[PDB]
């Protein structure tokens, strides 16, 4: 399993040790407070009131936790995933990323502590 932090200001994303393979079932639990600029802090679900103006993931609110599996598109993680299975032809290292607009990560603060584990299958 993997346990670590994902800094909101980390545009490249946090690479984990989790290699998602075909047929894998995974569980992710994320917690913490982070910001995409404002003094206020939000959770892994981001800011439900903030409009999407170029986010790396259009399927989640700004300030939410997302991930990539291999060289796939951004996938919503939010508070986490319970016994989750990836789409077909999706595989590779899991990279956790703070959902924000490309090139704006500079003024982000906080982070998310995240737990990733593979489930029995
Ligand atoms: C509108 O209510 C509003 C717009 C922007 C904002 O902060 C910026 O949000 C950007 C993402 O949309 C980007 O992350 C900037 O760096 C932030 O300063 C708050 C509220
Ligand atoms: Ca920002």
């Amino acid at each position: 399993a993997w346990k670590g932090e994902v800094l909101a200001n980390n545009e490249a994303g946090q690479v984990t040790s989790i290699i998602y393979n075909p047929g894998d079932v995974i569980t992710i639990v994320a917690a913490g407070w982070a910001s995409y600029g404002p003094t206020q802090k939000w959770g892994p679900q981001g800011d439900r009131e903030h409009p999407d103006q170029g986010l790396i993931c259009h399927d989640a609110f700004c300030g939410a936790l997302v991930m990539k599996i291999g060289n796939s598109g951004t996938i919503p993680v939010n508070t986490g995933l319970f016994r989750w299975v990836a789409p077909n032809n999706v595989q590779g290292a899991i990279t956790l990323i703070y959902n924000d607009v490309p090139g704006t990560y500079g003024n982000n603060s906080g982070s998310f502590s995240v737990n990733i584990g593979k489930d029995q299958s």
Side-chain angles (χ1 to χ4, degrees):
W2 181 86
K3 182 178 181 57
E5 299 291 339
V6 184
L7 269 59
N9 72 342
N10 183 10
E11 185 172 17
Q14 179 60 52
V15 178
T16 68
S17 63
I18 304 296
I19 308 295
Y20 184 96
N21 301 310
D24 281 348
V25 180
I26 63 174
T27 289
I28 297 178
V29 177
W33 306 93
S35 174
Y36 56 90
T39 302
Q40 185 177 8
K41 290 288 208 306
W42 291 264
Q45 291 179 327
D47 187 343
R48 63 191 297 270
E49 296 184 356
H50 189 69
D52 185 342
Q53 296 175 345
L55 301 172
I56 63 171
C57 186
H58 303 285
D59 294 344
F61 291 133
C62 178
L65 176 57
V66 303
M67 71 174 179
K68 289 186 178 182
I69 303 181
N71 63 333
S72 76
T74 55
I75 300 178
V77 175
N78 299 125
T79 61
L81 303 173
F82 185 80
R83 302 178 179 180
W84 178 86
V85 176
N88 308 327
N89 303 324
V90 172
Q91 56 183 355
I94 294 185
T95 302
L96 301 169
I97 315 173
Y98 191 74
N99 192 18
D100 208 344
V101 174
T104 69
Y105 287 74
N107 65 334
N108 297 1
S109 61
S111 64
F112 293 142
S113 61
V114 181
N115 285 273
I116 305 182
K118 296 187 172 184
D119 302 320
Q120 84 179 8
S121 61

